[PDB]
């Protein structure tokens, strides 16, 4: 005959943002040098 009223509640939760990324690239530039440290005719005496 005794009806008791009760109130229930569950705990809340917490989320968080995040990200993923594959490997990254970057540019590059090269110029080949053309040095010619060469004389005309060295008179050798080997």
């Amino acid at each position: 005959i005794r009806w008791e009223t009760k109130s229930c509640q569950t705990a809340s939760i917490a989320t968080a943002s995040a990200s993923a990324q594959a490997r990254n690239h970057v540019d590059a530039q090269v110029q080949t040098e053309a040095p010619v440290p060469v004389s005309v005719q060295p008179p050798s005496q080997y």
Binding site: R23, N24, H25, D27, A28, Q29, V30, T32, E33
Partner: protein, 86 residues
Amino acid sequence: RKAVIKNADMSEEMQQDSVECATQALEKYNIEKDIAAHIKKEFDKKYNPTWHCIVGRNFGSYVTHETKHFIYFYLGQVAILLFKSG
């Protein structure tokens, strides 16, 4: 075939492999395309594909590489560009 590294974005161990691979390639192969091919293939095997190699005496380039996978160096008078992309 003395090696001089001009620029690199590469670990020291990979730099050594780059020189050693090119050095062997130059000892074995006389033709530029064949030297390049040797070098490229050795890197695909050990460091996975996709590598690209340019070997020559007169060129300029503008390329994109994967971080930490770029080297540009000379062996004597010949420049070698070795990098991964894709």
